Amino acid sequence: STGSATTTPIDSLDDAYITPVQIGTPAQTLNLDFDTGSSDLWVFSSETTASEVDGQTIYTPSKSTTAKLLSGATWSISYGDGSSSSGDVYTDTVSVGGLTVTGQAVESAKKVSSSFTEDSTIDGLLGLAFSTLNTVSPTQQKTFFDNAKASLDSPVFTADLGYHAPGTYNFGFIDTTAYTGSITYTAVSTKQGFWEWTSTGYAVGSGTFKSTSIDGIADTGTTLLYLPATVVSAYWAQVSGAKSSSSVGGYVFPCSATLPSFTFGVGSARIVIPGDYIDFGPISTGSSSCFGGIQSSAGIGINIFGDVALKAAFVVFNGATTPTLGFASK
């Protein structure tokens, strides 16, 4: 089997992407944030505290003839941005782009933190990291990809995120029309439950490539590119007036600037992020100070190749017995 679904930016900045997902019988369609940095499929629901729902579409398990309570199971998750959610668990039929999994754990939110309530466009998350990170207790549950893998034509999914435009998540096949050149594959460590790999270095604009190993994670659920402070300082030094602002919480730059590109290495290959992808707009409405799309990871504990980096590439998440990642230009 295969599946193919379009993913759409939630706003004009590409702050996140939503993908329609069918849950239950008859289908209830919710728009989920596909997150290769976590491993829980959770949804706003009829059980969510009413004051914490503000415009989202909810899953109502009582209206699904295939929903079954997973007796005794609870879940609770906290994300790197400080947000969180928790609740109970059903199993139900879940389909993405024509690919159907029966018996998928659908984690029903009883509580969500304010940032989730305040984002009316995201109805939940669909985790695509390794199932060892799944938070369901006392019986850990598998991700949608893990459950579908054996039925897939090939044990892969691909992320093709657009810049200010829709893109595609495919399951079970590699669309050879969706990228240019060849796909360069690189080793993955699953030891922390992430799609963790080592970039071979970087360049700023037309500058020379610096060969240096950068361990990080391919994370569709993080907006920006988070890299070591040395690398980030080298980038922003090329932008007149750019500075790190503790009050704003990162590097800002004059909105009048033209940003240089940023290149990252994948083995001997190179992915180029155009400068425009690094502009996240005014820090507040009407400000002439703009927020940068490359930020320091020094306070995170891990480097994160988020959407800013991933949307410059066609990315293969290869879930073979030894997982690997592939990157192509497009």
UniProtKB/Swiss-Prot annotation:
The active site is at 35, 199. It catalyses: Hydrolysis of proteins with specificity similar to that of pepsin A, prefers hydrophobic residues at P1 and P1', but does not cleave 14-Ala-|-Leu-15 in the B chain of insulin or Z-Glu-Tyr. Clots milk. Its EC number is 3.4.23.22. Disulfide bonds join 255-290. GO terms for biological process: proteolysis. Keywords: Aspartyl protease, Disulfide bond, Hydrolase, Protease, Signal, Zymogen. Residues 17-328 form the Peptidase A1 domain. One of its GO terms (molecular function) is aspartic-type endopeptidase activity. Belongs to the peptidase A1 family. This is Endothiapepsin. The lineage of its organism: Eukaryota, Fungi, Dikarya, Ascomycota, Pezizomycotina. The gene is EAPA. The chain holds residues 90 to 419 of 419 of the full protein.
